[PDB]
Design a protein around this ligand. Structure first.
Ligand SMILES: [Cu+2]
Length: 155
């Protein structure tokens, strides 16, 4: 309501499914979406992946290139058994603040759920971007500054 609260939970095989069903090509080090369905399948510190960075299927937030004319659909799989990680899209840019300064959020998620065994907290939220550059951050203290952010180049 405040932010996008489209919270759900699947299970492990759906994570595998979603990871396949992603339009994010590997621009060498960076990730680059393509097609009008910019289906951003992302995850946050799943038990095995170390802190503090956000996972983006093939990589861990190098940076995201986006085709401006497309519809963005952020599919989180935040299943960090501790922190209700958020995905909050705005500007700010690096360095991100240690204190979670909630600068005017465009699209964002007000802290997605914290599952138990087997189940996988996901959140499908939609966004229509504008050309140039934005950044997304997890507005939990330290998290953004320490690593879980992503530069969104919309061109
Ligand atoms: Cu976080």
């Amino acid at each position: 309501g405040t932010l996008d609260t489209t919270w759900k939970e699947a299970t492990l095989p759906q994570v595998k499914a979603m990871l396949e069903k992603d339009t994010g090509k590997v621009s060498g080090d960076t990730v680059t979406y393509s097609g009008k369905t910019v289906h951003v399948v992302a995850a946050a510190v799943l038990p095995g992946f170390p802190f503090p960075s956000f996972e983006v299927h093939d990589k861990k937030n190098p940076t995201l290139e986006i085709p401006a004319g497309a519809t963005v659909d952020v599919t989180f799989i935040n299943t960090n058994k501790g922190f209700g990680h958020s995905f909050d899209i705005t500007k700010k840019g690096p360095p991100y603040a240690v204190m979670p300064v909630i600068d005017p959020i465009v699209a964002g998620t007000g802290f997605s759920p914290v599952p138990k065994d087997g189940k996988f907290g996901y959140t499908d939220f939609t966004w229509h971007p504008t050309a140039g550059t934005y950044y997304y951050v997890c507005q939990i203290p330290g998290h953004a500054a320490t690593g879980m952010f992503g530069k969104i180049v919309v061109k």
